[PDB]
């Protein structure tokens, strides 16, 4: 009737109960999914703002609806803060997601059928970099590069060979599952020789870039894309950056009216909140701890006899290579899940095992590090993981051990802060 | 530092102040932008949920991340509630927006270059129905149909003519600025004639469809798209429905992994909350009031001698034809804005005037009807609008009159409920 009196606790108990139970779930597990994080209550408050009521097609001071004077201030703050954060000249804070950020760049620079060179799914590249079931592979001529079959590291000579062979219109750098540094300078050197554009998709490592813990793609890429969630620890959404303002104009037009309609102004306000958090000195210390934790985790696993792809990590990601142990990554991830530790199965490059099964798992540190985990806590986590993997090697039924480990997980995770 | 201590009113005063001022702005104006509404506090609470922390690529029970048991419950509730609301067999509640919902249908059914027949911008169709600056016009062979030049109404014989001529692969029905009923059965007869798919984009009128106040496209269209905001009064996002389970499977794959990545689970929970509100008996009463208010608004303006396109309306939209009055839509909308009344300039079909200028305005009743406006109140609004337009005909400067009306707008809007 008067919807302004509708309170969720009263009007939708089912959804209210589900939200409560999700909070409990997040609080009670060890979240090692590499792409996940926990946002601040401040981000949540802005995320839930009545700014959702406002249609704001266009850009600040250049909208297609009157009445945007306040939402313009929010978007301008998001843009100014992220430009400061990444030391860049152009930003677009409107993309609804990492995927839409990428698509805006495609719409700005490419025609359907154009050749695009990206990291293969097999090697740890993202869906949106040319995978067959994604728009990027369906509507464009996607060709792929892969890591070295021995070292599992990016091979720039190979990329240059493929760039000359295929003359791509766009070369993408970036990944969803790769544990080492990328040389963006080399990517630009290669695209210039073949007359291609260079897009750097830094969704996973955006927080490292922002704090100088990874080389910035801003001097090198024509377009830089990212999620605002993941290591940046912002609300769920996308982001495009560049130091090329002429390409920036093309990206602006590609995002709207090219790709999206009304932006999510409440999410953009939340992006501003998260960017201000990123600008705090403590954010650099957080990313340094994220990386330190990842190295401790990898080392605890090696100590227990498990193999780590590339032998370690320069980032938040740890890739476990389970081939010598006869354990599938699917079986591992599922047992770990029942033990209170969430992670993903992960394909080992060049493995002939179905990607549905895999021979690896992918672990990430940002979420627990946000809850205050230090190195010794990730050492403990590494041993819990090893305990479960050992059980899968030596038992048909891992239920007893899963319950054992879940007991430990529960006593460890309740020691760290969470939402009030 | 522990970000769980971050409270918005302490860590980001600038954003806090902007949100506070946006609440004030929304509260103090007469909002006649037809695509706008006000969501319930319950929807806002879910919208700001920590469900944003969960990655949930895939679909309920078929995700690419463990840990989705609770978010799966929210999405399933959204799906079941919307299927009941629209009496349909298939629903996708993941689209980030109306634009992305439409793009999923394109990815599901079309190839770049395919011929697509949709309503022209000039006649009140949407950007995503084939407009040149949008992906739909850039990447496809977009051809358009327009309203009748004498009546300003959809001519089905004309649409059928263009379908026979162009043999489109897809025919779209739906609009952003059209004030009358659309016959979906006619549209389906026409696509069957030429072997095309039929998409009904009901974003604006979705509330009328949900409550039986407009013919449903469910029995007729291969795919039905919508926003969840607008007349449905939900969180900002998109929606796809169908009665065709086969098409449904294709749409599911087109949305993910075709177009999007991680869904916004907090928004999906909010969609579920809003769908339950939609299922209440009062929502039907609300839509009926929306329509009666629009008719009252059009009639009041007519009393004052102003012209209404098509002579009235069957929905939430009132189109004012300002040509006989020598007032541009740009001057009208801008003068009204300063007087506390927000609306859009609107291109009159076939008018030679630049669409930047226009010779019309577009008014809508859902936002104020949500605040409890009745017919007599929209009559008052109509006279306030007419007062401003009279001023633009007879004044070198409308400032004094804008302030006079703003005082009256202020006195009227304060009488109606809003957020606490």
Curated annotation (Swiss-Prot), chains A, B:
The answer on whether this UniProt entry bears the keyword GTP-binding reads no
UniProt feature coiled coil, ranges? none
Q: Which UniProt keywords apply?
A: Amino-acid biosynthesis, Cytoplasm, One-carbon metabolism, Pyridoxal phosphate, Transferase
Task: List membrane-spanning regions.
Answer: none
* EC numbers for this chain: 2.1.2.1
Hey, which pathway is this one from?
A: One-carbon metabolism; tetrahydrofolate interconversion; Amino-acid biosynthesis; glycine biosynthesis; glycine from L-serine: step 1/1
Provide the residue positions that the database annotates as binding (6S)-5,6,7,8-tetrahydrofolate. Answer: 121, 125-127, 246, 354-356
- At the top level, the lineage of the source is Bacteria
GO BP of this protein: glycine biosynthetic process from serine; tetrahydrofolate interconversion
Q: Does the keyword Amino-acid biosynthesis apply?
A: yes
What reaction(s) does this enzyme catalyze? (6R)-5,10-methylene-5,6,7,8-tetrahydrofolate + glycine + H2O = (6S)-5,6,7,8-tetrahydrofolate + L-serine
The coenzyme or cofactor needed here is:
pyridoxal 5'-phosphate
Q: Where is this site: Plays an important role in substrate specificity?
A: 229
Per the record, the similarity remark reads: Belongs to the SHMT family.
Q: Which NCBIfam families match?
A: PRK00011.1
Function recorded in the entry: Catalyzes the reversible interconversion of serine and glycine with tetrahydrofolate (THF) serving as the one-carbon carrier. This reaction serves as the major source of one-carbon groups required for the biosynthesis of purines, thymidylate, methionine, and other important biomolecules. Also exhibits THF-independent aldolase activity toward beta-hydroxyamino acids, producing glycine and aldehydes, via a retro-aldol mechanism.
| Protein name in the entry | Serine hydroxymethyltransferase
Gene name of the encoded protein? glyA
């Amino acid at each position: 009737m008067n919807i302004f009196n509708n309170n969720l606790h009263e009007t939708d108990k089912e959804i209210n109960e589900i939200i409560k139970h999700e909070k409990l779930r997040q609080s009670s597990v060890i979240e090692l999914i590499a792409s996940e994080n926990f946002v601040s209550p401040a981000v949540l408050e802005a995320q839930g703002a009545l700014l959702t009521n406002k249609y704001a097609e266009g850009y600040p001071s250049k909208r297609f609806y009157n009445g945007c004077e306040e939402v313009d201030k929010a978007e301008n703050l998001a843009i100014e803060r992220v430009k400061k954060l990444f030391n860049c000249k152009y930003a677009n804070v409107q993309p609804h997601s990492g995927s839409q950020a990428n698509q805006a760049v495609y719409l700005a620079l490419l025609q359907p059928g154009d050749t695009v060179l990206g990291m293969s799914l097999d090697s740890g590249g993202h869906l949106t970099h040319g995978a067959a079931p994604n728009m990027s592979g369906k509507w464009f001529n996607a060709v792929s590069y892969s890591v070295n079959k021995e070292t599992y590291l990016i091979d720039y000579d190979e990329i240059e060979r493929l760039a000359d062979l295929h003359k791509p219109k766009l070369l993408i750098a970036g990944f969803s599952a790769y544990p080492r540094n990328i040389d963006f300078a080399k990517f630009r050197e290669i695209v210039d020789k073949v007359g291609a554009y260079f897009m750097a998709d830094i969704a996973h490592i955006a927080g490292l870039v922002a704090t100088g813990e990874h080389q910035s793609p801003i001097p090198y890429a024509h377009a830089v894309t990212s999620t605002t969630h993941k290591t940046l620890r912002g609300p769920r959404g996308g982001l495009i950056l560049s130091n090329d303002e002429e390409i920036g104009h093309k990206i602006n037009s590609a995002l709207f009216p090219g790709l999206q309609g009304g932006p999510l102004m409440h999410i953009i306000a939340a992006k501003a909140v998260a960017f201000l958090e990123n600008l705090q000195p403590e954010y650099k210390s957080y990313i340094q701890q994220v990386i330190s934790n990842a190295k401790a985790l990898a080392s605890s696993l090696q100590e227990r006899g498990y193999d780590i792809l590339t032998g370690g990590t320069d980032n938040h990601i740890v890739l476990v290579d389970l081939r010598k142990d006869g354990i599938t990554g699917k079986l591992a991830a599922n047992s770990l899940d029942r033990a209170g530790i969430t992670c993903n199965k992960n394909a080992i490059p060049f493995d002939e095992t179905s990607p549905f099964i895999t021979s690896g798992i992918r672990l990430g540190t940002p979420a627990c590090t946000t809850r205050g985990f230090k190195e010794k806590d990730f050492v403990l986590v590494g041993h819990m993981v090893a305990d479960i993997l050992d059980g899968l090697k030596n038992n048909e039924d891992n239920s007893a051990l899963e319950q054992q480990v879940l007991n430990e997980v529960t006593k460890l995770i309740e020691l760290f802060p969470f939402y009030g």
